[PDB]
JSON list of C-alpha atoms in Angstrom, two decimals:
[
{"chain": "A", "resi": 1, "resn": "UNK", "atom": "CA", "xyz": [92.18, 117.96, 147.44]},
{"chain": "A", "resi": 2, "resn": "UNK", "atom": "CA", "xyz": [90.63, 119.64, 150.70]},
{"chain": "A", "resi": 3, "resn": "UNK", "atom": "CA", "xyz": [93.76, 121.71, 150.96]},
{"chain": "A", "resi": 4, "resn": "UNK", "atom": "CA", "xyz": [93.26, 122.56, 147.75]},
{"chain": "A", "resi": 5, "resn": "UNK", "atom": "CA", "xyz": [89.35, 123.22, 148.58]},
{"chain": "A", "resi": 6, "resn": "UNK", "atom": "CA", "xyz": [90.68, 125.77, 150.95]},
{"chain": "A", "resi": 7, "resn": "UNK", "atom": "CA", "xyz": [92.98, 127.53, 149.42]},
{"chain": "A", "resi": 8, "resn": "UNK", "atom": "CA", "xyz": [90.17, 127.86, 146.43]},
{"chain": "A", "resi": 9, "resn": "UNK", "atom": "CA", "xyz": [87.76, 129.28, 148.98]},
{"chain": "A", "resi": 10, "resn": "UNK", "atom": "CA", "xyz": [90.52, 131.95, 150.48]},
{"chain": "A", "resi": 11, "resn": "UNK", "atom": "CA", "xyz": [91.32, 133.09, 147.23]},
{"chain": "A", "resi": 12, "resn": "UNK", "atom": "CA", "xyz": [87.80, 133.60, 145.78]},
{"chain": "A", "resi": 13, "resn": "UNK", "atom": "CA", "xyz": [86.54, 135.41, 148.77]},
{"chain": "A", "resi": 14, "resn": "UNK", "atom": "CA", "xyz": [89.54, 137.53, 148.43]},
{"chain": "A", "resi": 15, "resn": "UNK", "atom": "CA", "xyz": [88.69, 138.00, 145.14]},
{"chain": "A", "resi": 16, "resn": "UNK", "atom": "CA", "xyz": [85.24, 138.86, 145.86]},
{"chain": "A", "resi": 17, "resn": "UNK", "atom": "CA", "xyz": [85.90, 141.45, 148.47]},
{"chain": "A", "resi": 18, "resn": "UNK", "atom": "CA", "xyz": [88.16, 142.92, 145.93]},
{"chain": "A", "resi": 19, "resn": "UNK", "atom": "CA", "xyz": [85.36, 143.29, 143.21]},
{"chain": "A", "resi": 20, "resn": "UNK", "atom": "CA", "xyz": [83.27, 145.11, 145.65]},
{"chain": "A", "resi": 21, "resn": "UNK", "atom": "CA", "xyz": [85.42, 147.16, 146.50]},
{"chain": "A", "resi": 22, "resn": "UNK", "atom": "CA", "xyz": [86.27, 148.25, 143.03]},
{"chain": "A", "resi": 23, "resn": "UNK", "atom": "CA", "xyz": [82.77, 148.11, 142.05]},
{"chain": "A", "resi": 24, "resn": "UNK", "atom": "CA", "xyz": [82.21, 151.21, 145.25]},
{"chain": "A", "resi": 25, "resn": "UNK", "atom": "CA", "xyz": [85.13, 152.78, 143.46]},
{"chain": "A", "resi": 26, "resn": "UNK", "atom": "CA", "xyz": [83.73, 152.96, 140.06]},
{"chain": "A", "resi": 27, "resn": "UNK", "atom": "CA", "xyz": [80.09, 154.13, 140.99]},
{"chain": "A", "resi": 28, "resn": "UNK", "atom": "CA", "xyz": [82.05, 157.30, 143.09]},
{"chain": "A", "resi": 29, "resn": "UNK", "atom": "CA", "xyz": [84.33, 157.94, 140.31]},
{"chain": "A", "resi": 30, "resn": "UNK", "atom": "CA", "xyz": [81.12, 157.62, 137.98]},
{"chain": "A", "resi": 31, "resn": "UNK", "atom": "CA", "xyz": [79.20, 160.42, 139.76]},
{"chain": "A", "resi": 32, "resn": "UNK", "atom": "CA", "xyz": [82.58, 162.65, 139.81]},
{"chain": "A", "resi": 33, "resn": "UNK", "atom": "CA", "xyz": [82.54, 162.27, 136.06]},
{"chain": "A", "resi": 34, "resn": "UNK", "atom": "CA", "xyz": [79.29, 163.29, 135.14]},
{"chain": "A", "resi": 35, "resn": "UNK", "atom": "CA", "xyz": [79.36, 166.21, 137.50]},
{"chain": "A", "resi": 36, "resn": "UNK", "atom": "CA", "xyz": [82.46, 167.45, 135.74]},
{"chain": "A", "resi": 37, "resn": "UNK", "atom": "CA", "xyz": [80.74, 166.60, 132.72]},
{"chain": "A", "resi": 38, "resn": "UNK", "atom": "CA", "xyz": [78.14, 169.17, 133.40]},
{"chain": "A", "resi": 39, "resn": "UNK", "atom": "CA", "xyz": [80.69, 171.32, 134.81]},
{"chain": "A", "resi": 40, "resn": "UNK", "atom": "CA", "xyz": [82.27, 171.10, 131.26]},
{"chain": "A", "resi": 41, "resn": "UNK", "atom": "CA", "xyz": [79.04, 171.86, 129.44]},
{"chain": "A", "resi": 42, "resn": "UNK", "atom": "CA", "xyz": [77.96, 175.03, 131.69]},
{"chain": "A", "resi": 43, "resn": "UNK", "atom": "CA", "xyz": [81.77, 176.30, 130.77]},
{"chain": "A", "resi": 44, "resn": "UNK", "atom": "CA", "xyz": [81.15, 175.34, 126.66]},
{"chain": "A", "resi": 45, "resn": "UNK", "atom": "CA", "xyz": [77.83, 177.60, 126.86]},
{"chain": "A", "resi": 46, "resn": "UNK", "atom": "CA", "xyz": [79.44, 180.42, 128.47]},
{"chain": "A", "resi": 47, "resn": "UNK", "atom": "CA", "xyz": [82.17, 180.32, 126.44]},
{"chain": "A", "resi": 48, "resn": "UNK", "atom": "CA", "xyz": [79.80, 180.31, 122.94]},
{"chain": "A", "resi": 49, "resn": "UNK", "atom": "CA", "xyz": [77.88, 183.12, 124.75]},
{"chain": "A", "resi": 50, "resn": "UNK", "atom": "CA", "xyz": [81.57, 185.38, 125.07]},
{"chain": "A", "resi": 51, "resn": "UNK", "atom": "CA", "xyz": [82.20, 184.69, 121.74]},
{"chain": "A", "resi": 52, "resn": "UNK", "atom": "CA", "xyz": [78.79, 185.76, 120.11]},
{"chain": "A", "resi": 53, "resn": "UNK", "atom": "CA", "xyz": [78.91, 188.57, 121.88]},
{"chain": "A", "resi": 54, "resn": "UNK", "atom": "CA", "xyz": [82.89, 189.38, 120.87]},
{"chain": "A", "resi": 55, "resn": "UNK", "atom": "CA", "xyz": [81.88, 188.91, 117.29]},
{"chain": "A", "resi": 56, "resn": "UNK", "atom": "CA", "xyz": [78.11, 190.98, 117.57]},
{"chain": "A", "resi": 57, "resn": "UNK", "atom": "CA", "xyz": [80.51, 193.83, 119.28]},
{"chain": "B", "resi": 1, "resn": "UNK", "atom": "CA", "xyz": [84.66, 116.82, 147.85]},
{"chain": "B", "resi": 2, "resn": "UNK", "atom": "CA", "xyz": [86.57, 117.10, 144.25]},
{"chain": "B", "resi": 3, "resn": "UNK", "atom": "CA", "xyz": [83.16, 118.48, 143.00]},
{"chain": "B", "resi": 4, "resn": "UNK", "atom": "CA", "xyz": [83.52, 121.38, 145.55]},
{"chain": "B", "resi": 5, "resn": "UNK", "atom": "CA", "xyz": [86.71, 122.23, 144.58]},
{"chain": "B", "resi": 6, "resn": "UNK", "atom": "CA", "xyz": [85.72, 122.58, 140.64]},
{"chain": "B", "resi": 7, "resn": "UNK", "atom": "CA", "xyz": [83.29, 124.76, 141.54]},
{"chain": "B", "resi": 8, "resn": "UNK", "atom": "CA", "xyz": [85.24, 126.90, 144.05]},
{"chain": "B", "resi": 9, "resn": "UNK", "atom": "CA", "xyz": [87.65, 127.49, 141.22]},
{"chain": "B", "resi": 10, "resn": "UNK", "atom": "CA", "xyz": [85.09, 127.97, 138.60]},
{"chain": "B", "resi": 11, "resn": "UNK", "atom": "CA", "xyz": [83.77, 130.71, 140.98]},
{"chain": "B", "resi": 12, "resn": "UNK", "atom": "CA", "xyz": [87.33, 132.31, 141.50]},
{"chain": "B", "resi": 13, "resn": "UNK", "atom": "CA", "xyz": [87.79, 132.91, 137.60]},
{"chain": "B", "resi": 14, "resn": "UNK", "atom": "CA", "xyz": [84.73, 134.59, 137.37]},
{"chain": "B", "resi": 15, "resn": "UNK", "atom": "CA", "xyz": [85.32, 136.47, 140.02]},
{"chain": "B", "resi": 16, "resn": "UNK", "atom": "CA", "xyz": [88.90, 137.16, 139.00]},
{"chain": "B", "resi": 17, "resn": "UNK", "atom": "CA", "xyz": [87.30, 137.82, 135.35]},
{"chain": "B", "resi": 18, "resn": "UNK", "atom": "CA", "xyz": [85.01, 140.65, 136.50]},
{"chain": "B", "resi": 19, "resn": "UNK", "atom": "CA", "xyz": [87.22, 142.42, 138.79]},
{"chain": "B", "resi": 20, "resn": "UNK", "atom": "CA", "xyz": [89.71, 142.24, 135.74]},
{"chain": "B", "resi": 21, "resn": "UNK", "atom": "CA", "xyz": [87.49, 143.65, 133.66]},
{"chain": "B", "resi": 22, "resn": "UNK", "atom": "CA", "xyz": [86.34, 146.08, 136.56]},
{"chain": "B", "resi": 23, "resn": "UNK", "atom": "CA", "xyz": [90.06, 147.41, 136.63]},
{"chain": "B", "resi": 24, "resn": "UNK", "atom": "CA", "xyz": [90.36, 148.24, 132.80]},
{"chain": "B", "resi": 25, "resn": "UNK", "atom": "CA", "xyz": [86.81, 150.27, 133.00]},
{"chain": "B", "resi": 26, "resn": "UNK", "atom": "CA", "xyz": [88.42, 151.61, 135.75]},
{"chain": "B", "resi": 27, "resn": "UNK", "atom": "CA", "xyz": [91.62, 153.22, 134.19]},
{"chain": "B", "resi": 28, "resn": "UNK", "atom": "CA", "xyz": [89.94, 153.67, 130.91]},
{"chain": "B", "resi": 29, "resn": "UNK", "atom": "CA", "xyz": [87.49, 156.42, 133.11]},
{"chain": "B", "resi": 30, "resn": "UNK", "atom": "CA", "xyz": [90.37, 157.99, 134.71]},
{"chain": "B", "resi": 31, "resn": "UNK", "atom": "CA", "xyz": [91.98, 158.19, 131.09]},
{"chain": "B", "resi": 32, "resn": "UNK", "atom": "CA", "xyz": [88.64, 160.42, 130.58]},
{"chain": "B", "resi": 33, "resn": "UNK", "atom": "CA", "xyz": [88.37, 162.00, 133.76]},
{"chain": "B", "resi": 34, "resn": "UNK", "atom": "CA", "xyz": [92.00, 163.37, 133.33]},
{"chain": "B", "resi": 35, "resn": "UNK", "atom": "CA", "xyz": [91.00, 164.51, 129.54]},
{"chain": "B", "resi": 36, "resn": "UNK", "atom": "CA", "xyz": [87.95, 166.31, 130.56]},
{"chain": "B", "resi": 37, "resn": "UNK", "atom": "CA", "xyz": [90.12, 168.00, 133.44]},
{"chain": "B", "resi": 38, "resn": "UNK", "atom": "CA", "xyz": [92.69, 169.23, 131.34]},
{"chain": "B", "resi": 39, "resn": "UNK", "atom": "CA", "xyz": [89.60, 170.32, 128.92]},
{"chain": "B", "resi": 40, "resn": "UNK", "atom": "CA", "xyz": [87.80, 172.53, 131.87]},
{"chain": "B", "resi": 41, "resn": "UNK", "atom": "CA", "xyz": [91.03, 174.25, 132.85]},
{"chain": "B", "resi": 42, "resn": "UNK", "atom": "CA", "xyz": [91.55, 175.11, 129.35]},
{"chain": "B", "resi": 43, "resn": "UNK", "atom": "CA", "xyz": [87.42, 176.10, 128.55]},
{"chain": "B", "resi": 44, "resn": "UNK", "atom": "CA", "xyz": [87.95, 178.16, 132.01]},
{"chain": "B", "resi": 45, "resn": "UNK", "atom": "CA", "xyz": [91.39, 179.87, 130.44]},
{"chain": "B", "resi": 46, "resn": "UNK", "atom": "CA", "xyz": [89.82, 180.87, 127.56]},
{"chain": "B", "resi": 47, "resn": "UNK", "atom": "CA", "xyz": [87.01, 182.54, 129.34]},
{"chain": "B", "resi": 48, "resn": "UNK", "atom": "CA", "xyz": [88.57, 184.70, 131.18]},
{"chain": "B", "resi": 49, "resn": "UNK", "atom": "CA", "xyz": [90.70, 185.78, 127.93]},
{"chain": "B", "resi": 50, "resn": "UNK", "atom": "CA", "xyz": [88.10, 186.18, 125.97]},
{"chain": "B", "resi": 51, "resn": "UNK", "atom": "CA", "xyz": [86.33, 188.41, 129.18]},
{"chain": "B", "resi": 52, "resn": "UNK", "atom": "CA", "xyz": [89.38, 190.62, 128.91]},
{"chain": "B", "resi": 53, "resn": "UNK", "atom": "CA", "xyz": [89.47, 190.17, 125.33]},
{"chain": "B", "resi": 54, "resn": "UNK", "atom": "CA", "xyz": [85.86, 191.77, 125.31]},
{"chain": "B", "resi": 55, "resn": "UNK", "atom": "CA", "xyz": [86.11, 194.41, 127.90]},
{"chain": "B", "resi": 56, "resn": "UNK", "atom": "CA", "xyz": [89.54, 195.98, 125.72]},
{"chain": "B", "resi": 57, "resn": "UNK", "atom": "CA", "xyz": [86.93, 195.75, 122.32]}
]
């Protein structure tokens, strides 16, 4: 049972480290995603203004 | 020792489940990221197109 406890402790430490790394990567990806969402919203605004001017002309 | 092993295993499963949920969130967000990337590319192409269209108009 002591050997089993050692195995479990090592497995859990590995899993916790991996989870922390994945959380960091998720936060970075979320920042990138919101920046690109802002970019897309700007593009949509400009395209809408373009279409309005097109229909006016 | 068995009590310690039981706590260690429980902690391992909780960290593993949080890791798996984090991974599925990661892949769903990557899907959304690729989708919005393609969307923004299409908006930029349409913006250019509409620019020359309005010039000709």
